[PDB]
Design a protein around this ligand. Structure first.
Ligand code: HEM
Ligand code: HEM
Ligand SMILES: Oc1ccc(Cl)cc1
Ligand SMILES: Oc1ccc(Cl)cc1
Lengths: 137, 137
């Protein structure tokens, strides 16, 4: 289930992080406007940019911690508050997060691994509600 | 064949029991709610818990006894009745058992071992029928 999925992702995190974030950017190409120098590039081109791998891994490092600190897929209020207050997130709204989780869930349902995709959908929804509660537009 | 599979499983009952049970919960995550003490725990966390290894083994011990007592993958009526009237199975339906055997067969097919998967599928089918006859919804 959800807890084991965290361990699964953490066991091969860079690969899962890149593949999920790529799924997100390919599903929602206009989301590249938040990220400098990602436009006009194929997956393989992105994966060879030093910053892409480093940054995507850090995002998923933190996502796994938030998920791991959750109870029944409900994140901590302080984790939501940190995500809202991060300067790197100043121009984001809940819809950015919703779209990332739609892509994440769709990646999980399509993959060879027995992810508990329904729990990640719940977690995504609960995170969006928490971000809203913490003051994200 | 089926008889050898019973010997194989019995030979390392702890491991196979835990492996197949987890394959079951992974394929059908909603089933975890029947085991409230296993909720929100990783696979390694679960294996450190006394009752997880002990109770899952006891489940598969009885499964093997039922399997061994069967003729041509047809279990005894008395064994089916034991399963229906166990207090722990009061809120269960044949669908719970179907799912366990679907996962068990999938596990067998995906393992590198020459399990008689078709026989376990048939055993599962015959047991589900027997449970129904014994009054399980
Ligand atoms: C649970 C979901 C998310 C987590 C845990 C998270 C976490 C992080 C972390 C840890 C960083 C720092 C990375 C670094 O400096 O190397 C970062 C940066 C950033 N994030 Fe988020 N993030 C999430 C969702 C999103 C979403 C949905 C977007 C927009 C679609 C976004 C946009 C950005 C941007 C623009 C930066 C700075 C530029 C960059 O790293 O390329 N984040 N995020
Ligand atoms: C042929 C298949 C099955 C056999 C032989 C079997 C046998 C057993 C046995 C021997 C126990 C007692 C374990 C102990 O406490 O020492 C048990 C308990 C229990 N079983 Fe079943 N079972 C089967 C299928 C299922 C299924 C499909 C479910 C639900 C999805 C289920 C749910 C439970 C629950 C909730 C308990 C009590 C929890 C616990 O033991 O900690 N069983 N079963
Ligand atoms: O640098 C990155 C990489 C992935 C995400 Cl979701 C956000 C920022
Ligand atoms: O504790 C347990 C473990 C597995 C099963 Cl089927 C029932 C109870």
């Amino acid at each position: 289930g959800f807890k084991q999925d965290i361990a699964t992702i953490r066991g091969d995190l860079r690969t899962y992080a890149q593949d999920i974030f790529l799924a997100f950017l390919n599903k929602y190409p206009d989301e590249r406007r938040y990220f400098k120098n990602y436009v006009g590039k194929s997956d393989q081109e992105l994966k060879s940019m030093a910053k892409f791998g480093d940054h995507t891994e850090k995002v998923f490092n933190l996502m796994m911690e938030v998920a791991d600190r959750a109870t029944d897929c409900v994140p901590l209020a302080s984790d939501a508050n940190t995500l809202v207050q991060m300067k790197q997130h100043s121009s984001l709204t809940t819809g950015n997060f919703e779209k990332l989780f739609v892509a994440l869930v769709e990646y999980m349902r399509a993959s060879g691994q027995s992810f508990d995709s329904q729990s990640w959908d719940r977690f995504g929804k609960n995170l969006v509600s928490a971000l809203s509660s913490a003051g994200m537009k």
